[PDB]
Amino acid sequence: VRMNVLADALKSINNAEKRGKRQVLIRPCSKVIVRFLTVMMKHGYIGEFEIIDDHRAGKIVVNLTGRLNKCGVISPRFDVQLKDLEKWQNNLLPSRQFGFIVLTTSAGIMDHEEARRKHTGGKILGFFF
Amino acid sequence: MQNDAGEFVDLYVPRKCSASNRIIGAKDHASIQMNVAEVDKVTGRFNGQFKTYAICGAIRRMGESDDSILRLAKADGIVSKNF
Amino acid sequence: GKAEDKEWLPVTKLGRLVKDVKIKSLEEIYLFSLPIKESEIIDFFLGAALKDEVLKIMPVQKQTRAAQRTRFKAFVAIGDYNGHVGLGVKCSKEVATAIRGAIILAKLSIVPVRRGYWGNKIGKPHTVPCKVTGRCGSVLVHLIPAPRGTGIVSAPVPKKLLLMAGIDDCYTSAWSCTATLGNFAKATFDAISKTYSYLTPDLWKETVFTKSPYQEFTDHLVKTHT
Amino acid sequence: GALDVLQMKEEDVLKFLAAGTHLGGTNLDFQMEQYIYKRKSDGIYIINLKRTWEKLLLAARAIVAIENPADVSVISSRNTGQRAVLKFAAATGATPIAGRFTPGTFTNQIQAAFREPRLLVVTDPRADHQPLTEASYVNLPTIALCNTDSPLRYVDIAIPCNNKGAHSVGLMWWMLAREVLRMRGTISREHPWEVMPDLYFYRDPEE
Amino acid sequence: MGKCRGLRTARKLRSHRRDQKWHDKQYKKAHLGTALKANPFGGASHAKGIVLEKVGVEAKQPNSAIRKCVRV
Amino acid sequence: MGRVRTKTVKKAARVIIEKYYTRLGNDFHTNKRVCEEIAIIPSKKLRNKIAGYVTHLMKRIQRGPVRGISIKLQEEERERRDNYVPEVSALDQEIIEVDPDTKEMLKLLDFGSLSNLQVTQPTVGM
Numbered sequence A: 001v002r003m004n005v006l007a008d009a010l011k012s013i014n015n016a017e018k019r020g021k022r023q024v025l026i027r028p029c030s031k032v033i034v035r036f037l038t039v040m041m042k043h044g045y046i047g048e049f050e051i052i053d054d055h056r057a058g059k060i061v062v063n064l065t066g067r068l069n070k071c072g073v074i075s076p077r078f079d080v081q082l083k084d085l086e087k088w089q090n091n092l093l094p095s096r097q098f099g100f101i102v103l104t105t106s107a108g109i110m111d112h113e114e115a116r117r118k119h120t121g122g123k124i125l126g127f128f129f
Numbered sequence B: 001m002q003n004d005a006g007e008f009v010d011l012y013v014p015r016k017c018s019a020s021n022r023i024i025g026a027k028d029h030a031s032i033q034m035n036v037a038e039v040d041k042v043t044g045r046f047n048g049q050f051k052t053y054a055i056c057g058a059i060r061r062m063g064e065s066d067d068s069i070l071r072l073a074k075a076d077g078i079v080s081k082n083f
Numbered sequence C: 001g002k003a004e005d006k007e008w009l010p011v012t013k014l015g016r017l018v019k020d021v022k023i024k025s026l027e028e029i030y031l032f033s034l035p036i037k038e039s040e041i042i043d044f045f046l047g048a049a050l051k052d053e054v055l056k057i058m059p060v061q062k063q064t065r066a067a068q069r070t071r072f073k074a075f076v077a078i079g080d081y082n083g084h085v086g087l088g089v090k091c092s093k094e095v096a097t098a099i100r101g102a103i104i105l106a107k108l109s110i111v112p113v114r115r116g117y118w119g120n121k122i123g124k125p126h127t128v129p130c131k132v133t134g135r136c137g138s139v140l141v142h143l144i145p146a147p148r149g150t151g152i153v154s155a156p157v158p159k160k161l162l163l164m165a166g167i168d169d170c171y172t173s174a175w176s177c178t179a180t181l182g183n184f185a186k187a188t189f190d191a192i193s194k195t196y197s198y199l200t201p202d203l204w205k206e207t208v209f210t211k212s213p214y215q216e217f218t219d220h221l222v223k224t225h226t
Numbered sequence D: 001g002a003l004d005v006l007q008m009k010e011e012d013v014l015k016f017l018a019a020g021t022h023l024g025g026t027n028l029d030f031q032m033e034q035y036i037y038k039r040k041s042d043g044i045y046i047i048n049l050k051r052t053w054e055k056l057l058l059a060a061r062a063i064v065a066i067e068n069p070a071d072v073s074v075i076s077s078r079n080t081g082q083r084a085v086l087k088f089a090a091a092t093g094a095t096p097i098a099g100r101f102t103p104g105t106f107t108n109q110i111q112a113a114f115r116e117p118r119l120l121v122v123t124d125p126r127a128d129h130q131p132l133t134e135a136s137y138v139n140l141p142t143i144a145l146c147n148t149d150s151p152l153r154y155v156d157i158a159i160p161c162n163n164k165g166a167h168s169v170g171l172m173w174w175m176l177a178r179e180v181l182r183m184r185g186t187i188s189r190e191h192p193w194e195v196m197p198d199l200y201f202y203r204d205p206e207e
Numbered sequence E: 001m002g003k004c005r006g007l008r009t010a011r012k013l014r015s016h017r018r019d020q021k022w023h024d025k026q027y028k029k030a031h032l033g034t035a036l037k038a039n040p041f042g043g044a045s046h047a048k049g050i051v052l053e054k055v056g057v058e059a060k061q062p063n064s065a066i067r068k069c070v071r072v
Numbered sequence F: 001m002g003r004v005r006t007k008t009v010k011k012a013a014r015v016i017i018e019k020y021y022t023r024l025g026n027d028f029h030t031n032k033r034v035c036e037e038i039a040i041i042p043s044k045k046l047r048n049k050i051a052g053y054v055t056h057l058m059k060r061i062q063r064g065p066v067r068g069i070s071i072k073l074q075e076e077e078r079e080r081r082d083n084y085v086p087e088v089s090a091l092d093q094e095i096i097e098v099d100p101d102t103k104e105m106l107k108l109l110d111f112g113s114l115s116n117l118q119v120t121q122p123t124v125g126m
C-alpha cells in the first residue's frame, strides 16, 4: 500500500543512524523527499546524497554524518498559520537553540525560521534535530 | 558552548568516537584510546610522533571496532592501500 | 595527644597520580571515562562542599525457617551545588553502617551535569540544555528547560537531586508508579546523567586528542610509591 | 606498512606455508569475511597472507607505542599457547598469564593478582573470553589471533591465522616478537634472528 | 493498536469518545438519572426528618463497639 | 570410619614438604622427628598425622610431580625442557608443499618456486 512515501523514507534514515551506518539507500524517491533532504543538508545534519535513476520512481543514497539525532513526520499534513507555530515548536522541538521544523509554504519547502522571516504559514511535513 | 559575551561556560568538552561521531560519556567503561606508532619511513624504526584513536563502547560491543580501526588506519597511510 | 594521620595509602594507579599532585581535576578523569574506584579521589578534588542527604531508609526482609530476617536499605544523595551530583544505596544489617556505606557509593558515582540557557546566553547557565528523559523500571522522568527565576517545578524527591546538581530552573514531569523512591531517584539521576551524553550543534567541532594520564605519567608510575 | 622495508619477504611466506598458518576452519563468521581468499574444493577456507601480515604489523605498531614494556600483559589459557606467551614475555618484557585466569584480576582492588595493564594480547577470543569480558570494564584495548570462526566481540586488532595447530600458534607469537623488537630499535633489519621459532612451539609430550 | 489519524475523521473520533464516556463510572452515575432518583436526599446536602427510634449498630469484626445510630 | 585428613593437616604437610624437601625420606619414624624439630606442632596426635601425610606425599613425589607443591629438583626438569631440545629440530623438512587455489593465491602476491599440487574428489564424503 504505502500511503505515505516521506514517512518511510524518514523512518529508514532514522533506523540506520541508531546503528552507526555510513550510508543508506531509500526508495522510492519523490520531489518532497529531495527538498526535505536538501533542507536537512543545508544545515549540516547529513552529507551529500546521490539519486539513482531507474526508469521508475528511483532510489536515493544518503551519506550519513553522526550528527543527526532524530528526524520524523507529522502524519496528517495540518495547516499551520504563523500563530500556531510557537505552540507547534514547543511540542516537537527539544530546545530553543537548535532543531528545525519543516513546512511547505506557497514559496517552497522550508523551515520555520525562514517562514517567520518571510511571513508565511503552510502545511507541516516533519522535523529534525 | 559559549554565551553572548563570548566566554566558554562548560565543565569540559567530551571526546567523540572516531567511527560513529557520537560523544563518549563519563561512565563508558568500555571505550578505549588505542594509540599506534609511526615509523621513520626509511629504516622502519619508531620515532616519537604517533596516532591516536577513540572507539565508543557500543560499536565495540557489536564487534565492529576491528573493521573500524582498519578503516581509520587505511584512510591515513599507516596502511596506504591494497590491504 | 597524638597526631599525624596517614590514611589513604593508594592501591590503584589513579590513586597514585591523584594523591601525588600530578593530576589537576576530575574533569581530566571524566574526559578519559576512567572508573573511579577509591572514595578519596573525590574528597581530594571536591570535599569542602560535598553535602550528603539521606533520602530514605527502607526495611526489607527475607522469610527464614525460624524468623523474618530484616535489614535496612539507605538511599543517600550527595553533591556540591555547582555541577556535580551522585546517588548511592546500600543494604546493611543496622542503620548506622548502611548510612555510612551508602555515602561511599554516592561519592563514587559522582557525574558532571551540563547546564545551558533558556532564551539567550547572558552568562552563568541556569537550566538543562535540552529536554531529557530517564527511566528505571517503569518510572519515566522528563526534564525541560525553563526561563530564569521559575525555580524547580517538580516533586519533593527529584527536587532534592536537581538542586544538588546545580540547576536553578526546570520543568519536570513524571508518569509512573513514582511512589517507590528507589526508582524515582534512579530515574532522576539517569536523566541528569544523560545531560552530557547528548550531541548538540555546539559539540560538532572535531576532537583534539590529548595524552591519557597513564601515558603522560608513565615515568612516575614506574616508581612513585615503590 | 605501505613501504618496502616492512613488506613481506620470500623467506617468511615459506615459514607460513610450512607451519600451515593459511589453513582456516570449516565455518566462517560474517566479521572475518574480509580476511578469506576463497573456500577450498573440500569445505575449508584459505586465509589471505598479505592481510595477516598487515594486521600483525598493526599489532606491533600498537605494542611499540606503549612506553613501559611491562603493562602489555599477554594471556594464554589453552595448552598450545603457554610456552609461546612465556617466551614472548621473556623476549620483550611483558607479563604473561598461562593457565587459569581467576576472574576479577582486572576489576578487584583486594586480590594479590590484581593488575592494571595498558594492552592485552590473547591467543584465541573464543577460549579466553574471560579476559575480554573483564577488559570490557576498565577501558582495556585488545589484540587477538583469530581463526576463521572467531567472534570478534571486544577485540580491537584481530590477526587472522590458523589458531588450532601448535606450529601455527608458536610461529605467530615468534613473528610478533621479531617485529616489535625490530621497530623498537634493538635487533635491526637486514639480519636473520638468533632465536628459531621452535623455542615457541608446544611440547606435545616427547619420547 | 490503532486509531484513525486522518484529516476528515472528526466525526468518528467525536462519536467514539461520546460513546465510550458512558463506561466511566462517575460520568454515568452523574449523567444517567438513576442515582438522583435512588438518592434518599433529593440531590441536596442536608435533610430534616423525624426520629423513629434509636438503634444499636454493632461494628465490623476487627473492632468491637455498639455505634448507637438513630432511624429517621 | 573417617581417616580423611583435614585442611589444617594437609596445608601443614604441604608447607613442610615445600620448604624442607631434602630432609624428608620414605619412612615414618624419621619424618616424625624431622617435622618435630623443624616446626612447632602443639600436640602429639597432630604431629603424627602431619608426619603420616608427609610420607604419603613423598611416596608420590618420587613419581610424576603433584600439582600443589613446587620444589627445585622438579622445576629444572621443566625449565630444561621448556628451553629448546634436539627432539624438535627446525620446521621438520623445509620443502613443505601446497595445493591449488593456494598457488593461485600466492601468484597474487608474487611467489614462484618450490611447491606441488593435488586435486580431490569433487565434494565432502565422496
Ligand SMILES: [Mg+2]
Pocket: C179
Ligand atoms: Mg500507589
Ligand SMILES: [Mg+2]
Pocket: none
Ligand atoms: Mg461492557
Ligand SMILES: [Mg+2]
Pocket: E025
Ligand atoms: Mg461500581
Ligand SMILES: [Mg+2]
Pocket: E025, E026
Ligand atoms: Mg474514576
